[PDB]
Design a protein around this ligand. Structure first.
Ligand SMILES: O[C@H]1[C@H](O)[C@@H](O)CN2CC[C@H](O)[C@H]12
Ligand SMILES: O[C@H]1[C@H](O)[C@@H](O)CN2CC[C@H](O)[C@H]12
Ligand SMILES: O[C@H]1[C@H](O)[C@@H](O)CN2CC[C@H](O)[C@H]12
Ligand SMILES: O[C@H]1[C@H](O)[C@@H](O)CN2CC[C@H](O)[C@H]12
Lengths: 659, 659
């Protein structure tokens, strides 16, 4: 089960099973331990009030691939099949199940979130008979109880060449905010005259289904595919007609054309890759991390991933600084067009950030702690982060500036990056308070260490303010504009304090408390405000044991690893690399939970950080403050013979590291 | 009762009481004669169909500060209080009541529309008892009859340090257009363990309340605050969660931090001030006028005041040329950032003006007579002003050009000013008709003198067209773009005619009719098309007695005053200054009604005009046609020993005038 491209499970155990996701950055499909079922389907960009937090959320959507198969009237179930296996092929995001049904047939099915068609999904089923048999196949469209006011339709789209039977449902999110349309069809190889007749049943309020029978002689392969389109009023004006249109189009493209396009797009994604010799387990784990980030983002969009991407409803689908600081940097180096989508999400939401600042008594743009459709604040009101954790504004500025550093796109800097940098700097200029000594303070925040609430002069927050003001000032120079001289004055006098032992103090009330996650250490990486190796080391020694084992997110140990790599300490770097994610795994596919021993995968934020530990730490790769990518000193794990990182920077460079 | 900073009323008489307003440009709170109550609360930017005119209106909102206080079960009433006094502190917009309850305790309360937090209010209550006693306090959220489909909630927001009890209501404006949320909490000094238990009652369909009891020992002062947030779907997508978020935020900022920020913002506003020596009554009156304008506007927004600002529902909250010509000029000189918001309102509504022009058969932008949320026409259809009073378009142009003259901001001129000037000049170019003699006429309008309906070649209207065309042409030159030569050709030949006595004729059917308000005289000031002193004087002599005493708005005598000041006639200037507002006052705070002996305060338009009579007339200050502020000859009232005007223009100049 340590293939470098494929994650495999024998005999899924539903009592201890965490499903894997396939996704195209628009739809995510999460696996069920049951054959020919899916657990959950999530559509990006569709939010309504629903369950957790009393705020907007991703909505469980139609499990559009759900299928029932019977052989001579006997329904196929976990209990009456054998040699059942599942496999995720990370090369093309194919999820495949295979099993034997008694003495009758082998069944294999593969499904896909098509990479070129954001709103289309396909499942291909192959039946190989050992005896004469008759299959009954049913595709069910069950309206999830997250939706309401559903309608269940069925029709035949015909001409002289085709009969495309469309199974369509239309329904609404809880408050009516979004209209969802789903339309499915079967694809056959045998042609209009010989294809099975499709029956339609509407026997329940919340479910209808299309079905057929097919006799298959012993020794034959019979194949069919289900194609489905899933779209909403958040994506298109008329989702009903558009879903049907899309499914007709896809059906007429056909399975082979669809998969070829899909494969070509996945091939391009994997032109940026990480290869490790001497550690098959690391190789597979890292490939999984890349696979998840690639599946949970999409170039040429304004979409940004939640902490759980499209693996489910984790954290309501909301967008956090997890994108800017954790998922964005690895994607910026490997596929800058993906990073461009992530920053586009914030650029499009700059007006909402301007509104938030005004409501809370500040200038410029104040990005929300949690963001969704509008760009307004979406944090649950019971969490003080929403009102008080303000570093997110600086996080967005840092990412904006980095986008320009790595691409060198001055047109983008003028049209998009400067609007962000200017407004965010205006925010910080209005957010600081000057004291009697001429220092600038940022008082009453929630720290990056979120356990420290309503404290003053948080190290990370203050650091992000400094960087935002500096980058805005640098941006202004690049574009030949005059930046307020106050931005530099303020940046140079924002307080960052040391305790009497010379360690960076996390906030003004900090002595020796346990902390949730890295904060002061973030000044060393990513901010690079602390570059002195002795200071980096002192801060590591003091804070590394301050993070408890329980209830602490995977936003710490990857940074420790990276910093120990930059200090050329292989043993410590490797220790922290493993600790960053191996204690957070769930079976059978080694998906990553938020915390150690947690059960809420897939925490793409954690993957993002670990990828930085590999690329920026072990690989020594770094965003050069004067432009482009450079390489600094690094070390590898003892047991790693070679590290190869491909497709880095706009020059698409390959980096090879050995002992 | 002639403190220069405070308006005071002893023992409010509810049979003859017109309340005063505190406001932050977003929320206005109007006083009740009753202790611990408010009369009315208005939120800017929220409009729906409601009562007058069958068009969009401000909506009476939650009286969110309404409180009941009892001492040992005995509620506070008219009959059991003494030494009851109210005071408005204009320095910081604090409305304070104080009273003695029997011989047992003294009570003070102060409330604020917080200046830095547009959507937050606070009331602070202090109780000093002379014997041991127990108070019961109730805060009530009554849904006004203007709203529907209300929901009444209560909950505790906790952590190890705090228990913030939130009293929240959500409701809808009449047609469902806007969702309103209000959320209140109590602030205590004593901390979570010792603070009173908060009870919740929901005994009515349209009212719920939170309450507590507190024992107070003899000789001690007990203090608490009520904080409330009031916001709508016009302001934020999710007003429900945003109100609760805001109130939590405010509570954790705390009273002292909130009032410090409030005070700092008010301090800045009063850096522009008018000081009069030798007339305490004038000094107080003028401070009131400045106070109301400062309270009813907001820098760094796109908000514009209605004729009654946030003092009530007067004229449905709509925006009229009252802003551009009456409130905007004094604010442009004192605080250009306030003027900037006023013109921003129009800029953001340029599309809607373009739509109006197209619908009425013209080119360019035709600004509506009455504006609200969209920028479309909002005048009641029974008033011919909405279809036919077209000078508003010229008024917006004049203000836009003046903004540039006073700031010299060429970037603003390019991005915003020119778009307005260009489109408005295109309107006038399409609005005029050329006659046989080569003159340009503007036929079938309602005059600035609104009593003249469906007449031709109104003096003021024609003059605004001339200026709009001139200013647009000059703008084009500044920016180096080529302006249609037709604009100057037209401007030079727009008809303005004289009667046989050499007086400017109001319109083509005018001989000697009574007029509603200044019209022909407006050509002298503000337009400055008539500069010849003998002409100005003849127009004054003819028209000054044409305005009746009754049913004529405070949009005339201030201009007469200013013009007599420019003619250096102190007696006439002072006569008209007093006549402009003193006959319009309502007790006990000397608020200003629209007309003489009227009962509909507060007419902020009138204050705006009178402020021009003071600044531009007595002070001699003037917007120079070539840029900046200049000073022309003027006189003072005999009894005024000194006039000091501070914070004028972008140089923030002080002007001092004596006899
Ligand atoms: O942004 C992080 C935060 O830094 C952590 O304390 C964990 N949080 C949980 C949800 C999201 O991942 C968020
Ligand atoms: O804002 C986030 C925070 O970043 C996370 O650590 C988890 N919290 C739980 C509720 C809310 O989503 C809040
Ligand atoms: O614009 C003015 C108009 O010039 C006057 O005749 C009175 N009107 C009443 C409402 C608003 O003040 C409007
Ligand atoms: O247009 C305004 C006019 O400017 C005012 O003098 C009052 N009028 C009454 C109805 C309507 O608001 C109309």
């Amino acid at each position: 089960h340590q293939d470098p491209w494929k994650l495999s499970a024998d005999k899924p155990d539903s009592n201890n099973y965490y499903g894997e996701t396939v996704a195209n950055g628009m739809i995510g499909i999460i696996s069920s331990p049951e054959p020919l079922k899916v657990k959950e389907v999530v559509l990006a960009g569709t939010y309504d009030i629903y369950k957790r937090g009393r705020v907007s959320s991703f909505i469980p959507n139609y499990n559009l691939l759900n299928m029932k198969l019977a052989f001579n009237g006997e329904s196929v179930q976990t209990y009456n099949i054998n040699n059942y296996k599942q496999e995720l092929d990370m090369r093309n995001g194919a999820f495949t199940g295979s099993f034997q049904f008694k003495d009758l047939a082998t069944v294999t099915y593969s499904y896909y979130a098509l990479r070129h068609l954001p709103h289309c999904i396909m499942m291909v089923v192959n039946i190989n008979t050992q005896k004469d048999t008759e299959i009954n196949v049913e595709n069910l469209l069950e309206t999830p109880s997250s939706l309401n006011n559903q309608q269940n339709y069925f029709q035949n789209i015909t001409n002289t060449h085709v009969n495309i039977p469309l199974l369509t449902s239309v329904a609404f999110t809880p408050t009516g905010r979004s209209k969802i349309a789903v339309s499915n069809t079967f694809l056959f190889d045998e042609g209009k005259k010989l294809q099975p007749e499709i029956l339609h049943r509407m026997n329940d309020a919340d479910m209808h289904a299309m079905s057929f029978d097919k006799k298959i002689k012993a020794g034959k392969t019979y194949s069919f595919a289900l194609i489905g389109s899933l779209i909403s009023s958040d994506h298109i004006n008329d989702p009903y007609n558009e879903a049907e249109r899309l499914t007709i189009y896809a059906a007429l493209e056909g399975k082979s054309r669809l998969l070829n396009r899909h494969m070509q797009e996945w091939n391009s994604l994997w032109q940026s890759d990480i290869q490790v010799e001497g550690d098959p387990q690391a190789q597979q784990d890292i490939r999984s991390m890349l696979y998840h980030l690639y599946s949970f983002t999409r170039k040429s969009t304004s979409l940004s991933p939640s902490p759980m991407g499209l693996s489910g409803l984790g954290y309501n689908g909301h967008v956090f600084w997890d994108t800017e600081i954790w998922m964005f940097p690895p994607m910026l180096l490997l596929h800058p067009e993906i990073a461009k989508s992530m920053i586009e999400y914030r650029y499009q939401r700059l007006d909402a950030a301007r509104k938030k600042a005004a409501i809370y008594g500040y200038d410029g743009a104040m990005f929300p702690w949690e963001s969704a459709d509008s760009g307004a604040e979406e944090t649950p009101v019971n969490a003080l982060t929403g009102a008080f954790e303000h570093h997110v504004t600086g996080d967005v500025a840092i990412a904006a500036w980095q986008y320009y550093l790595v691409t060198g796109d001055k047109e983008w800097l003028k049209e998009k990056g400067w609007p962000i940098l200017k407004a965010t700097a205006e925010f910080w200029a209005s957010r600081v308070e000057k004291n009697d000594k001429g220092e600038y303070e940022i008082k009453n925040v929630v720290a990056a260490d979120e356990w420290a609430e309503n404290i003053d002069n948080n190290a990370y927050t203050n650091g992000t303010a400094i960087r935002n003001l500096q980058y805005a000032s640098k941006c202004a120079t690049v574009l030949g504009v005059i930046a307020p001289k106050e931005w530099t004055l303020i940046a140079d006098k924002i307080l960052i304090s040391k305790m009497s032992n010379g360690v960076t103090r996390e906030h003004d009330s900090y002595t020796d408390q346990n902390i949730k996650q890295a904060d002061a250490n973030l000044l060393a990486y990513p901010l690079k405000l602390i570059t002195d190796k002795e200071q980096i080391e002192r801060d590591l020694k003091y804070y590394q044991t301050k993070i408890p084992q329980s209830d602490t997110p995977a936003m710490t140990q990857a940074i420790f690893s990276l910093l120990y790599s930059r200090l050329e300490d292989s043993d410590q770097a490797y220790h922290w690399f493993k600790d960053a994610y191996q204690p957070n795994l769930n079976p059978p596919f080694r998906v990553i939970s938020e915390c150690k021993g947690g059960t809420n995968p897939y925490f793409s934020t954690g993957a993002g950080g670990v990828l930085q530990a590999v690329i920026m730490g072990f690989g020594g790769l770094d965003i050069d403050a004067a432009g482009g990518i450079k390489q600094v000193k690094s070390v590898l794990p003892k047991n790693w013979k070679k590290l190869t990182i491909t497709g880095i920077g706009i020059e698409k460079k390959t980096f090879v590291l050995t002992h």
